[PDB]
Amino acid sequence: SGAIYVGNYRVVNRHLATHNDWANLVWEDSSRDLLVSSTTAQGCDTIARCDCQTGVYYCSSRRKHYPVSFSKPSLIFVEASEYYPARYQSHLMLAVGHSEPGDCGGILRCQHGVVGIVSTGGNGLVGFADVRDLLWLDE
Ligand SMILES: Cn1nc(C(=O)NCCn2cncn2)c2ccccc21
Numbered sequence: 697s698g699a700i701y702v703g704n705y706r707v708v709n710r711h712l713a714t715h716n717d718w719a720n721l722v723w724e725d726s727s728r729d730l731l732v733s734s735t736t737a738q739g740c741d742t743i744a745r746c747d748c749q750t751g752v753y754y755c756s757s758r759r760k761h762y763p764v765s766f767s768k769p770s771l772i773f774v775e776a777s778e779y780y781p782a783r784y785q786s787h788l789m790l791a792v793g794h795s796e797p798g799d800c801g802g803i804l805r806c807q808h809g810v811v812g813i814v815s816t817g818g819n820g821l822v823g824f825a826d827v828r829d830l831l832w833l834d835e
């Protein structure tokens with residue numbers, strides 16, 4: 697689990713969004729596994745505006761923050777899960793690292809701020825849904 701709070705927005709994995717998120721929907725994209733909903737309170741997270749390829753992510757299944765190198769956002773084939781059939785996921789970044797399904801929502805950060813959230817993984821890889829291209833999250 698996990699979410700990003702910036703301005704009056706909440707950014708979550710689309711597969712983990714709640715009924716309140718869908719009723720208060722701002723934008724979602726199934727191919728990215730992202731959903732953004734509106735909030736009443738101001739959030740404290742800052743989104744990175746950069747092309748960093750090194751950062752640190754939170755892995756709940758190890759209670760640890762791991763430093764990693766990751767690929768730039770790309771279109772990647774992802775196998776089926778209980779939430780989606782096998783498909784191409786867009787804006788996805790991969791790193792070598794541990795992850796399990798319930799690690800989705802863990803944040804990836806670089807020196808500039810929040811980069812993305814855990815969305816895919818297995819077999820020694822972890823995949824993050826990028827949010828840096830969503831410039832409207834800051835305005
Ligand atoms: C479109 N929609 N989907 C859900 C949902 O819970 N789906 C299972 C989780 N999921 C997997 N992938 C995407 N979501 C939902 C709930 C309330 C209103 C609208 C909704």
Ligand SMILES: Cn1nc(C(=O)NCCn2cncn2)c2ccccc21
Pocket residue numbers: 711729774775776777778779780785795796797798799800814815816817818819822823
């Ligand atoms: C981090 N992580 N996430 C998943 C997962 O099932 N994600 C559900 C959302 N999803 C995205 N594309 C398809 N389904 C996973 C599985 C095994 C090991 C690690 C994992």
Ligand SMILES: [Zn+2]
Pocket residue numbers: 744745746747748806807808809
């Ligand atoms: Zn950066």
